[PDB]
Write a protein that binds this ligand. Sequence first.
Ligand code: WXK
Length: 167
Amino acid sequence: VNSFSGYLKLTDNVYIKNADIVEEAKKVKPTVVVNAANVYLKHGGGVAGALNKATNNAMQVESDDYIATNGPLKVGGSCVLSGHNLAKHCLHVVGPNVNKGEDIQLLKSAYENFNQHEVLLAPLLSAGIFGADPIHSLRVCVDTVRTNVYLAVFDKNLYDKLVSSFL
Ligand SMILES: CC1(NS(=O)(=O)c2cnc3[nH]c(=O)[nH]c(=O)c3c2)CC1
């Protein structure tokens, strides 16, 4: 038993809710919250900008030190940093950005990072401003992640379409 509430159960291991990931994180304080990161960990907008704003920019300060030491992530890659006031840890995962021409096949590699963590609160990778079809992203998630994932979907309209079209 864990503290996630109100989720619809899609599969053995995937759950979905219409929620603001920032507010969900604030209340659950999960072990891991996933950020929809870019390779530079520049958290300017989308999920990343919202998470970072909720940390009062501490996420960005930590991220800038990480990049200065290690250089950029790979598309499809990830790193574990602090969860600040939102979670114990933040798993920064880089899904492909269709609006930059990145290969959508890398979405599966991005979701594979989730398998290193037993339980996660996460957004749909490559959705929103990253330009992928969220229905495709949900399918890849279900077919790739084997650990327990609680998906927060900000847009209520989108949430209903994802549920109603789920096979
Ligand atoms: C498919 C969807 N877009 S998104 O990329 O996942 C996203 C973008 N910005 C967000 N800002 C925020 O404050 N809370 C969020 O949950 C959030 C989620 C509708 C979820």
